């Protein structure tokens, strides 16, 4: 929350 | 309602 | 208990009705598409002006009143295509879907949101004219027959040294070439031309790089592109889905990390946290449809396509 | 088209 966000979007592997 | 996705189709993964 | 007054406008209809205060985005969306008889719903969304006057997509998995919609009455929404197919011929099956895309795309071209060179503008106008007027008829379509219409981008009219009669002649000759074309086929031909434009189906975001230099991100059906600040046509760098291992988001930063580990990471910044979040969401949506259109058609789609060529 | 719940 507030200013703070983190997220790793990993695309599908073959 | 119980629609869980942000657009009008399901997201996989 | 229907106490929230809404107005939803599509490219050619206006709906005014009330919703319950607990209505989710999806429920509002479902009522609109049922009312208009649209079945190819996956492309579409509801846009609204937030309190600061930024255009925002309604999240269908949250209540309407829980989202940053304004405090006016009625609440105002635009029903618009949000996601674009990779090929209109293969993927826009029904006449309504084709028409909604046609009108939206045409509005963008005529408003100079989507760049079009003059020759393309003229060809597009000729198909719009065939759709509107049907066949060119020398008996009826006298000199000046196009004089009322908005047919070309103002930039094309500003920048050039033709007058408006000369512009009509430019369009007329191609109108005459389309004699015999069904009005609906003219709309499809319009979209076939438009979908090859550099700006077509591109969502642009103002970003900066790690030195603070201004650029644009474009997000589209095939991936991400980075543009020079002064050129939204030709990508500086392209990132098709297949080349992306992950995108790592951290506050306002996003980092595109390649499949090729012998390639470098690319770091950019969105101006606001909310914008970075919007970038992720639109990437995820596009990538989902990318995967979906490469799988075999659903039963529903197989039937719509059969029903459609039955109607010939 | 115009629809209203009037």
């Amino acid at each position: 929350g507030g200013s703070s966000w983190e997220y790793i979007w990993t695309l599908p592997s073959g | 309602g119980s629609w869980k996705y942000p657009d009008a189709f399901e997201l996989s993964g | 208990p229907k106490t929230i007054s809404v107005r939803v406008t599509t490219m050619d209809a206006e709906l005014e009705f009330a919703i319950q205060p607990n209505t989710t985005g999806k429920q509002l969306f479902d009522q609109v598409v049922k009312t208009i008889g649209l079945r190819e719903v996956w492309f579409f969304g509801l846009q609204y002006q937030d309190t600061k006057g930024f255009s925002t997509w309604l999240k269908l998995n949250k209540k309407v009143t829980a989202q940053d919609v304004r405090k006016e009455s009625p609440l105002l929404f635009k029903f618009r295509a949000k996601f674009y197919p990779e090929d209109v011929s293969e993927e826009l099956i029904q006449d309504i879907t084709q028409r909604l895309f046609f009108l939206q795309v045409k509005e963008g071209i005529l408003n100079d949101d989507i760049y079009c060179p003059p020759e393309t503008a003229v060809l597009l106008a000729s198909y719009a004219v065939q759709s509107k007027y049907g066949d060119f008829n020398k008996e009826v379509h006298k000199s000046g027959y196009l004089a009322g219409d908005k047919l070309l981008p103002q930039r094309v009219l500003e920048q050039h040294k033709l007058n408006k009669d000369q512009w009509e002649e430019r369009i007329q000759v191609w109108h005459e070439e389309h004699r015999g074309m069904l009005r609906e086929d003219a709309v499809l031909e319009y979209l076939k031309i438009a979908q090859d434009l550099e700006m077509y189906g591109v969502n642009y975001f103002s970003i900066k790089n790690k030195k603070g230099s201004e650029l644009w991100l474009g997000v589209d059906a095939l991936g991400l592109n980075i543009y020079e600040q002064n050129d939204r046509l030709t990508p500086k760098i392209g990132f098709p889905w297949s080349e992306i291992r992950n995108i790592s988001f951290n506050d306002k930063k996003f980092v595109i990390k390649p499949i090729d580990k012998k390639a470098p990471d690319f770091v950019f910044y969105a101006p606001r946290l909310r914008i970075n979040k919007r970038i992720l969401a639109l990437c995820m949506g596009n990538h989902e449809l990318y995967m979906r259109r490469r799988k075999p058609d659903t039963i529903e789609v197989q039937q719509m396509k059969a029903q459609a060529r039955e109607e010939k | 088209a115009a629809a209203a719940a009037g």
Side-chain angles (χ1 to χ4, degrees), chain C residues 221-234:
Chain C
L222 297 178
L224 282 72
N225 289 294
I226 301 294
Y227 297 85
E228 307 285 1
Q229 186 188 27
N230 67 10
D231 179 354
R232 291 185 300 139
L233 299 179
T234 307

Side-chain angles (χ1 to χ4, degrees), chain C residues 169-187:
Chain C
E169 294 169 358
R170 295 297 325 285
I171 299 163
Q172 190 184 286
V173 296
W174 292 108
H175 179 199
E176 186 164 6
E177 288 303 302
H178 308 333
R179 166 186 311 296
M181 188 170 287
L182 301 176
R183 286 168 143 105
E184 295 89 7
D185 285 341
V187 161

Side-chain angles (χ1 to χ4, degrees), chain C residues 28-45:
Chain C
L28 175 56
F29 181 93
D30 290 350
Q31 173 174 0
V32 171
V33 300
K34 179 170 193 211
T35 297
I36 67 174
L38 173 78
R39 302 184 50 203
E40 298 171 279
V41 293
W42 33 89
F43 299 113
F44 290 88

Side-chain angles (χ1 to χ4, degrees), chain A residues 9, chain B residues 7 9 11, chain C residues 82-86 201-203 205 218-224 241 278-294:
Chain A
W9 180 42
Chain B
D7 298 297
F9 48 85
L11 284 186
Chain C
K82 171 172 190 183
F83 305 99
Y84 291 78
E86 288 171 45
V202 183
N203 303 274
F205 303 84
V219 178
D220 59 47
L222 297 178
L224 282 72
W241 305 117
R278 287 164 187 200
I279 293 170
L280 170 63
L282 187 63
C283 289
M284 290 186 70
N286 272 281
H287 180 258
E288 177 71 36
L289 295 186
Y290 176 94
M291 296 194 296
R292 191 171 146 123
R293 65 176 61 86
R294 280 163 181 67

